[PDB]
Design a protein around this ligand. Sequence first.
Ligand SMILES: O=C(/C=C/c1cccnc1)NCCCCC1CCN(C(=O)c2ccccc2)CC1
Ligand SMILES: O=C(/C=C/c1cccnc1)NCCCCC1CCN(C(=O)c2ccccc2)CC1
Lengths: 463, 463
Amino acid sequence: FNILLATDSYKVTHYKQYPPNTSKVYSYFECREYEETVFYGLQYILNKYLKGKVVTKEKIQEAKEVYREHFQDDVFNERGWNYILEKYDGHLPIEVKAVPEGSVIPRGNVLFTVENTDPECYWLTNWIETILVQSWYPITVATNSREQKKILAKYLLETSGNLDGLEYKLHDFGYRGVSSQETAGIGASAHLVNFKGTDTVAGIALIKKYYGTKDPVPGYSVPAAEHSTITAWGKDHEKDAFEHIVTQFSSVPVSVVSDSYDIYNACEKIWGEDLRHLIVSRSTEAPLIIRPDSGNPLDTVLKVLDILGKKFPVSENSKGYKLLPPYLRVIQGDGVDINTLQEIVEGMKQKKWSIENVSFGSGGALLQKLTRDLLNCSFKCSYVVTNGLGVNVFKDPVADPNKRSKKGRLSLHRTPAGTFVTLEEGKGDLEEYGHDLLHTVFKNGKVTKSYSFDEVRKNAQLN
Amino acid sequence: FNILLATDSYKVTHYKQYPPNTSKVYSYFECREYEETVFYGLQYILNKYLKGKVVTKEKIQEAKEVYREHFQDDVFNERGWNYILEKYDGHLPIEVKAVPEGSVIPRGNVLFTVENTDPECYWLTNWIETILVQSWYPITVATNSREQKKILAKYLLETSGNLDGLEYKLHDFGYRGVSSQETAGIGASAHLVNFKGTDTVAGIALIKKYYGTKDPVPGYSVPAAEHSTITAWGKDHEKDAFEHIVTQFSSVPVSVVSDSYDIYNACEKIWGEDLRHLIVSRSTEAPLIIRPDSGNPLDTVLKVLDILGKKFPVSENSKGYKLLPPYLRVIQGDGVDINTLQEIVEGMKQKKWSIENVSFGSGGALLQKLTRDLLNCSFKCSYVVTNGLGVNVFKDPVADPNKRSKKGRLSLHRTPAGTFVTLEEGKGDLEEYGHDLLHTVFKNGKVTKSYSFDEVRKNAQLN
Ligand SMILES: O=C(/C=C/c1cccnc1)NCCCCC1CCN(C(=O)c2ccccc2)CC1
Ligand SMILES: O=C(/C=C/c1cccnc1)NCCCCC1CCN(C(=O)c2ccccc2)CC1
């Protein structure tokens, strides 16, 4: 992996564009105003791509050779890169401060800043805006995931009386759904920050590898059928497969796609009559989690429950919402995203069903269908030293005041009302709102401070 | 990278959910019924994740351990995995036939298929469903980008008269916006199949590494300004900044953002007056490319052009559309996706403007913002051999008969009307619509057939 060619091409040409006599280029990152975001993931990109010796004779030469063909000219700054190579044995001469991983900071706040520690590397700061900006992703997943949690929390509480198994309500299916493998990892981790139910094994490694979990492994998973494992017995032997999968895994909790063919038959005939004996005989610690993924998450859950409440002994819980016997539960495989999640869950409430009966699972929406647009994650330059004297820089397009960028040296502070506040123009040095909450996490190619995935949990915690 | 950990979790439990005595699991990939897709991406996946020795006692042991704690039990099949390590020196006993990379195959056709070559590894086929399925991305990005190419070609022709510069009308600005690093590589590579303008350096490397290019410039890019390189000069020195960039790159086409502060000032005054002499004196082979980046993408382009035509000598090309002097062009790099693209270009026409004047730029929408959902990319099983008996498998969910699944062995064919037709139930053997268009591309861990990015290009070509 070469960092020399891991940025947006035109930046390779920025070094010549900054005012002459520029010693410092201070840049920050924020989710311009989902009122609060989970800041998570920077630590990953810092260890995997930024720390250590990132420059090498071979990497400086590879760059030139490419940018030579790419730009049909030698625009590439081999001069400046080669400088970093010798002067600091390839380590990047930049400082990066940030809010502790997992922090839930409201929109408009400085989550992390990047600046060059060596005056000649005034071009490095923004060079890495790209590589570093891709954190918008894990942050977004992390945020959106955590928002879907509150929705399940709000409704589980005002329906069951508590939050048992909350952390296992949104299961990550999106492994096949993501754009790449690496993404599968990163995204899976921005979920395990809010729930422990994940099928995208990848996100786990990353965690143990870049964040470390003292707990017994990050997320988990129960065995489950897929369309191939049931359609393979032939449409006529669907029963044979259902009964083979609940028996093979009579052991632990098993999930079984019941919509291969008429989801409402499988529920009313196969599970509620033929294999009635393999359900009721089950353990509460290992129920048969019926799983449809046919059409319209709301109407199906309701009808599924309706059918099941009818072939099985339903009970009314402390709050009045109907509840299936401990050996029968349901998971919403398809159509679930932060928006529909809200529909289904409230749709159940109106229908008196308890959010207990059902646990959900989102694929693409959960790990894809996310953009740097959603939370307005942006990396803009606010401070710069031109000729020994700094100047507060920022952009303010006319056709868009929403795109005004902060100006000057920034600092994150807790306000007397408990919330946060991002101070600009260096005013954070007036000793006003306590200490800056951002922490130097990166300086001269060496991770100066990291958090464990267990810490990220505690930070991103709800309520 | 351990292939034994690149699959949905439940699939780890799958091996024991198939009917007893199943020697063959054969599945297919299709873009369930964007009327035609570009099949691109399989070749990379095969090469980077499935080729060669993908199994090692170390990777089996790792999985074992991880999986054991994941499912809090050992449902992990090391016996069958261990089998492959021995029998075929860690090489996957599976065969994958597919359509030539770049193939613009309509919708509802079998693009690629998979099946285990060893009756012992019947379970293996689906295992890698996840791995393979992630191709929806490269397919989708190569497909969506191509569609946008059409909208561009369509109006460029009906406005300039030809298709010159077409392959540079959509510059990839999404490196900043993709979910991860590995994504930008894949994404950008799918874009480059349809255009040659990309700032996502990453993609090029992947091409030369997994597809190879004999061509000179597999991906081109000119120097450009970014907000930091301008705003750093201070609001009151935007002119100083503009005049500095045009000078540094007076010889080559240089793009320069102008919405730092008032896009309509930098155009009517900064470039139209204070620095006119620096634009009009430029080579056509190195124009100044004015680039707005905020405001209504259409309203802005028109006013931008309206200002420029009012400050520079505009001509009227044959077709009757207005055209700016050869040294002055516009690059619309914000808010451009297939929809808006189609609105702008269309809006430029009603307003008598040649698509020659503008060149677009998309990022988030181009590479990110696409889902396995869009083209209905799906991988399902359609044929299996149980007790030496082949059965045509399929799912036909009610409440969404649109998720139906083809049945039996498939083959791609070209119908006498020139288009394509996917044959099911093994009816392809009746040898009627010529030979199967699918070529075996992967046998027992060996790429038996790949295509140069030059061929893919020729396949994905338009008209
Ligand atoms: O194996 C699959 C993966 C399916 C899939 C499908 C498609 C793509 N990719 C993966 N299982 C689905 C997650 C099961 C995890 C837990 C088990 C324990 N559990 C309950 O006991 C329960 C209690 C109350 C309410 C609901 C459930 C909550 C849910
Ligand atoms: O390099 C950037 C990068 C912007 C950016 C933004 C955000 C993030 N990352 C990067 N933007 C401008 C580069 C486009 C270069 C090509 C040169 C050849 N060309 C024309 O000569 C022309 C002919 C006719 C009409 C229009 C143009 C078409 C445009």
